[PDB]
Amino acid sequence: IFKPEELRQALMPTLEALYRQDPESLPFRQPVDPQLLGIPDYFDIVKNPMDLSTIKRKLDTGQYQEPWQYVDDVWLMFNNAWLYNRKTSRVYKFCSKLAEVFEQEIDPVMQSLG
Ligand SMILES: CO[C@H]1CC[C@@H](n2c([C@@H]3CCCC(=O)N3c3ccc(Br)c(Br)c3)nc3cc(-c4c(C)noc4C)ccc32)CC1
């Protein structure tokens, strides 16, 4: 079993590594707001939205019981952006950069946590 403060200690540096990507992480620091962005179909397409602020709060409150639930939420964030945004868009290419960064940062941590 994984204690929530052990998960936070291990996993939150990989999340801070994503925040440190600037400007690539800027679209991802807060939930998508389809009203502000004038994209009324966003919630038609993205049925399980996720973003860095939601993941951070879940680490902060101990809502992950297992490290793979965290990894899954980060990838859900990525997949939502790749699904909604065109492959030529800045948000799409920024998402791809974040996934490259995350894949590096998460590998030694998950090796440690197993
Ligand atoms: C203060 O909080 C702000 C609120 C919103 C802002 N926002 C912008 C803005 C507005 C439009 C003009 C522009 O050019 N924006 C822009 C700004 C910075 C960068 Br970097 C980039 Br790229 C674009 N578009 C966004 C797209 C997403 C998105 C995702 C993920 N999945 O689907 C979508 C869709 C999410 C947030 C976005 C980011 C931060």
The residue extents of the domains of the chain are 1-113
CB 67 within 8 A of CB 110: yes
Write the burial class of residue 76 (CB in 10 Å: 0-12 exposed, 13-18 middle, 19+ buried).
middle
Distance between Cα 64 and ligand 1 center (Å) = 27
CA distances from 113 to 57, 69, 91, 93, 110 (A): 21, 13, 31, 30, 5
Which ligand 1 atom sits nearest the alpha carbon of residue 90? Answer: 22
98 Cβ below 6 A of ligand 1: no
Instruction: Report yes or no: 23 and 38 within 8 Å, Cβ to Cβ.
Output: no
Q: What is the CATH number of domain 1-113?
A: 1.20.920.10
Task: Round to whole Å and give the CA distance between 35 and 62.
Answer: 31
The DSSP line for 28-67 is GSS---HHHHT-TTHHHH-SS---HHHHHHHHHHT--SSH
Check pocket membership of 32 for ligand 1, CB cut-off 6 A.
yes
